[PDB]
Symmetry: D2
Subunit: 466 residues, 4 copies
């Protein structure tokens, strides 16, 4: 065993196989990618990287699976099974690009609309590259793993499929619930990031993962074995999803963290055609195509920000000038927030068209960022997809609907938030943006912006509805 001191979880023992996986270029890459990306430029505590998140997630994947094992030997959880879950935990974020979510969430979508690609599809490919380029496949056999079976089981824990599961049977289904839970989103990923992000952000966590594990249990639920919580834990589960939403409001969708993410993303776009990254057999790739070669994607990290800022080639004057505007803190100015009304959703189809709606300023000048906020399952209540159990009858699982819990829980479980920033920064400009934007809200029958009477005194009498 090998012990390592993570400040969130303490000293954690790593099995020598997990150490072999860790000490590879593919994994040590996560030392150079920030967890909250743009957040560092707002919360100066948030220097943490995906490397240390990736270790906690592995650690907690083990905690929970040993715990179920101990509490319930009848499950036949093997040391083979425990290792596989730990490995999924470790490798589950292997595929995050530069600035984590900025890459898969803003950059790739703008830079290559033609693909569907997510840090997880990346986490799985990077995992194959890791295994293959570092002779791990042998070492797994060495500790009683069976690669044909287990690499599948690991790949499927991360992403989902590829009864839909080649890796383990319906009798070991609860193992697919640990690292990334499609049934309801209650995963140890969240547990680690809540604790860790709060630690570094300087916000306190309200959610006790240790307690949840104490009360977990595996029960039959429709000829599949799911994980279950004590009946009394249900309150705490609604709170976790609140905590999460609360983290996004305060930190992960901070109005300025987001505009920094956006400014970097634009600089990358300005640089993308002109930056070659060396891959498999010397083939040159661009920042946006590098996700198609894991040799080259290994090299793509937060470094590239500085590669750009510290550059001197004039075909990058474009992108370098943006990034200097961050160093000097000329950000694009925020104009305001608003929300749709009644039953108006906003198609991902239409995001690109929204500045045009907002326009004398040109719409090239506006940015409009549309943020979906849910409890993980779009419109659905994820607690409606959790199985609970009583002290009296510890194997008889049950359902608990919202109305057996409280009336102070939310009526809707998902909303949209629209935020307008302006790229022209002066007071003449920014006033204009503020009048356009407030009339836009009134035109679309969106909400009066919080600041709306103050920034737009002559426009909020336009709407009786305000």
């Amino acid at each position: 065993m090998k012990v390592i001191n993570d400040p969130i979880h303490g000293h954690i023992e790593l099995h020598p196989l997990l150490v072999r996986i860790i000490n590879t270029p593919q994994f040590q890459r996560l030392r150079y990618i920030k967890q909250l990306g743009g957040g560092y430029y707002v919360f100066p505590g948030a220097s943490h990287n995906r490397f240390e998140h990736s270790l906690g997630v592995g650690y907690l994947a083990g905690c929970l699976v040993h715990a179920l094992g101990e509490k319930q030997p009848e499950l036949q959880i093997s040391e083979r099974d425990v290792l596989c879950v730990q490995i999924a935990g470790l490798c589950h974020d292997l595929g995050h690009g530069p600035f984590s979510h900025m890459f898969d969430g803003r950059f790739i979508p703008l830079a290559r609309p033609e693909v569907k690609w997510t840090h997880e599809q990346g986490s799985v490919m990077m995992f194959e590259h890791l295994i293959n380029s570092n002779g791990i496949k042998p070492v797994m056999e060495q500790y009683g793993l069976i690669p044909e079976e287990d690499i599948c089981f690991i790949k499927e824990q991360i992403v989902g499929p590829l009864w839909p599961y080649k890796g383990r049977p319906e009798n070991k289904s609860f193992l697919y619930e640990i690292v990334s839970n499609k049934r309801n989103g209650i995963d140890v990923d969240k547990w680690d990031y809540f604790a860790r992000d709060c630690h570094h952000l300087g916000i306190q966590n309200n959610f006790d993962y240790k307690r949840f594990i104490k009360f977990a249990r595996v029960c039959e639920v429709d000829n599949e074995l799911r994980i279950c919580a004590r009946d009394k834990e249900v309150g705490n589960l609604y709170d976790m999803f609140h905590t999460r939403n609360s983290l996004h409001r305060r930190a992960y969708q901070h109005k300025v963290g987001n505009i920094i993410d956006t400014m970097i993303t634009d600089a990358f776009l300005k640089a993308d055609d002109y930056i070659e990254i060396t891959g498999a057999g010397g083939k040159k790739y661009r920042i946006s195509t590098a996700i198609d070669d894991m040799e080259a994607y290994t090299k793509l990290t937060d470094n590239i920000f500085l590669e750009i800022l510290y550059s001197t080639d004039p075909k990058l004057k474009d992108a370098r000038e943006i990034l200097k505007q961050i160093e000097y803190r000329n950000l694009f100015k925020y104009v305001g927030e608003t929300q749709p009304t009644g039953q108006i959703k906003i198609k991902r189809e239409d995001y690109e068209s929204l500045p045009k709606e907002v326009a004398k300023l040109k719409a090239e000048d506006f940015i409009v960022d549309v943020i979906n906020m849910d409890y993980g399952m779009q419109e659905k209540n994820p607690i409606d997809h959790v199985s609970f159990y009583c002290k009296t009858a510890p194997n008889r699982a049950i359902r608990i609907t919202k109305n057996q819990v409280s009336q102070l829980l939310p009526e809707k479980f998902a909303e949209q938030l629209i935020r307008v920033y302006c790229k022209k920064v002066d007071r003449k400009s920014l006033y204009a943006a503020r009048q356009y934007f407030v009339q836009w809200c009134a035109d679309r029958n969106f909400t009066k912006p919080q600041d709306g009477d103050v920034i737009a005194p002559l426009i909020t009498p336009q709407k009786k509805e305000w």
Copy 2:
């Protein structure tokens, strides 16, 4: 000279020598012997803390905020006279909590003396006059530029409210009445202290940042009266604070077992009340329930009385002592389940007494035996949203205050701001008994069209098919 003290929540805090004089008196040191969460200690073993240390934090934070407004806004004319008076209100605001704090004013006195209406604050004010008077403080206030006729009023009114309705300070210094206990919307430093401190000791983490709130607080004209205001951006965090609070009540302050221990103690006190003399003003003897009428005698009434009873041997207390032993041994009245009203049924305080009778009545296939505890849960203002009573302000226009309705914030905020929780416990404890209670109770829920109890299918297999509606 100043005096430093190390509170583990707020750190080293400087006490003005007047505040030290107030502290070092029998009336205040009394708070060392009263637990903040009372019955909570017998469920959350971390919760040894007493009102003494809460009372210091609240004073400390009362000062923090009032110095802060002062600094940020000199135009407010906040004097060292004013700052002291707020600090003193903070310190003395819980002076009147009885044994086990809330159990006393919330369960005991109501059952033991229906004839009075009385609350730890009415007590905090009387105990404050006693303190001032019995310890020659009145001189010492003049000594630091306080004016007792004016300022003892101002202090008394910060604690309770009145007695423009305020003799103590004008409409131009109204924001000072918002610090220690906020009637406008409940956003007070009392909460801030207890959140931090109760979490510390309970072993829950706090999600609410008081330090941040103070940084963005500011005083603005709102209807020709000067109120405190928050930045527009803080509004999210305020909805969260009231959630945090409600969350604390669910987890800890209304814990099903903490509550039944509170109730068992309260019954033991009732059993002992007729038979325990407490010596007051001029040797007059008072009972536990009448001691609230004499602050000399109420000074002596503390958590001690639990042990005075348990360790006694007088047989007129076999009654109460036997209850309290049943806590030591952990024969509690057994919890049966929880349920909630439906549609828009509230439950009149009129009808609480009648509820066990109802439970005995149910006919699935005595009421002296049942207890039924009705717990009202809100965001402080019964049915109202307290954020709808907060004034915010923009970065652009820092004096122009504004309102922010729920709809400008989120759709994931609560639809209702107050609910009821009904809990049935049974005083007969065995397996034959407790099964019965579980059948009665579940048919009762079905009869009243209340919610299926979460555990309802498991404890009452043959009765939750009675309701199609479940």
Copy 3:
């Protein structure tokens, strides 16, 4: 199992037998005795009681013994053995009197010189009373304990003996090292109180118990099986004993905490002849004799402070008047601190005589408190009684002397601290005390008091040596 949320250790599972032991008058008594006693009147965070200390100690006793078990199955640690250690942990402080250490350390010694008695001799008798008065002896058999053997083993874990051990063999000796370690004082008692006292005091702990357990191991050391630490942990062990000493300086021997302890102790003495406590078969006992009947000692708790203060019988005017002087904060005034020199120890024989030496003020007026400060083993280095082990040879234990560690470790491992307080409080009085006291130091060739030139300007030129 039964879970309970201690804020120091988290949610901890209690075996149903341990719950039965806990839910008794003898144990719930610890809810009404403060851990740091007089400390509460200086550190207002320090409301904590021995009840919750007593649970942590049990919890940690289990942690460590499960851990050795897991790491080393060859030890034959049984569930019988684990329970017994947990029970010792739980019951090890059962015998603390009112204000914990004030009782066994100041009161009983002054009030009954004729006995030798310590909270542990009490912890063992109170344990027999608990077992006997609550039908536990049956319930132990029920979970495979063997009372004749195991109550001995428990009693011996707490106190020591009664190869000197009837409870377990030389092959299970490492179990006697967990709750109270005579070999070197490295016990989980310390671990719990460091963490807990710091939590409540508002001082931070510097010592990581979790890490120590990760590196513990059992090795042969002279045909007895001792617990051993990794070689690298040795630094951290010297630090723990420092942390401890550091806690005593700041908090446990605070000049004012101590004088409050002393004032209470005097009030008790004033009240002792006149307070009857009801024991076995109605026999009446005094506060000082109550340690001779566990029925009556069950009733003796911090309550007695208030029983006195709130009393009205005039044969207690004496003691009640003292306790009011604490409420009002008329403490006896502190005069100063000093230390012996060369090789002058101060016999416990001579403590009573010291005020006489200090004396116009009478010596009835002075108090002189002599505090011994060590690393647990009087003059000895306790690390010189710890066995370590290398990564290379995990069973070959070894010794590590101070000079293989550092030159910044202490030259001596024990010292004395003498503190003079005066019971007459005014400025005329207290000046006098300050001149007496400083001449006293010069007469005994003790150290110049830190404040000595300032409080005694005309006396510190008396000594050339200063």
Copy 4:
């Protein structure tokens, strides 16, 4: 207007708009890309923090203390001019740390350019002039009542020392030179920030309370110069701080493996140094080691350069890239053991280079292969006790300062205040090799009459009987 920022160590901290102007420059934002503990991150995975956030805390604490003295003692004449200058020194005091902070000024530059003497502070001062000059700050200082001729000196001198030896402020404002970097005894707010922050991120708890120290600090005449002083009672806590520090160096800052990673990087840089151009003032190209001579070019030199190398493909860097890959794969040079000199043998900085040769020489029954790292460990002032250079004061006489020698404190304090630690690593890694290293090294210790290595009987069974003295 003020600007608030949430540092997780100190909370929400208000930044004066001048400080914000200084912060939002290439020279300062550079500190976002330099890790505080450098190689430490590859052992303590929590230690992602950078000098940027340390640099903010140090500024924050520089202000705390100087406002505090001001409040407590108006007679000192501390102006808003003075407070700003100290805050700015705090902010800019680490501006000159190179890549991996201490690895750069402590290992790299010394090996790479013997010809210069240079330290992150000489760099912090030059980078400060560059910042001021390249970003029109000089105007903005006049704007808030600073006087650049005087104040840029005062700032430069707070950071480094001189250039009564101080042009920036008189002997009557000498206590201001004690805040950010204390030559008198090392008791600075730099330490306070790094203790709290490094512990936070390392996963160690701090034992040292800076908040308390500030509460009891006070300025007194000491030899017709005004120094800072501590209460008499604080002295215990000061010995503990210097212990805490030494304790941090043992556990973390000199961790046997963190150090060898620092060394491996340093060798990779050396391998790359001749072959990497960094563009400075007027297009002039500079090497990693010469970049410290041009602040335009040194602005660009950050931790980036590690990855610039690792991700490169130019074959003149096969050298350095191959080393850095050996870190990614965790082929470190293997650690062999630790030992210490004996009696009163120091080890001249003269002789460090010669030590591998000695280890190859030992004849138990090549030196290009060994590395030998000599680590000096003190309480900041080589052989001196820094408490012997602190002025204390009594409650009775708050202006009369005094000395407190070790003997008035304890006998459990350290006999010596500085020691040496010698560590041998071997660059050849296999079992045949590493055994050999372990025999050479243990005979070496016995030859020099150094201490038996703790692991010495186990790694060298046939050699620790060579010494009777063990």
